[PDB]
Design a protein around this ligand. Structure first.
Ligand SMILES: CCCCCCCCCCCCCCCC[N+](C)(C)C
Length: 30
């Protein structure tokens, strides 16, 4: 779990890009 972690690394970053959906969401309702 090297390329496991570097998976759940790039999981977190591309859930980054999810939140920054829910950014552009807030600014959808604006
Ligand atoms: C917008 C949603 C995209 C999500 C991106 C996540 C894809 C991750 C791609 C995996 C890359 C694998 C590279 C091979 C790694 C080899 N070692 C980990 C063993 C060094």
């Amino acid at each position: 779990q090297x390329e496991x972690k570097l998976x759940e690394x790039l999981x977190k970053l591309y859930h980054x890009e999810x939140e920054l959906x829910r950014x552009k969401x807030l600014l959808x309702e604006x």
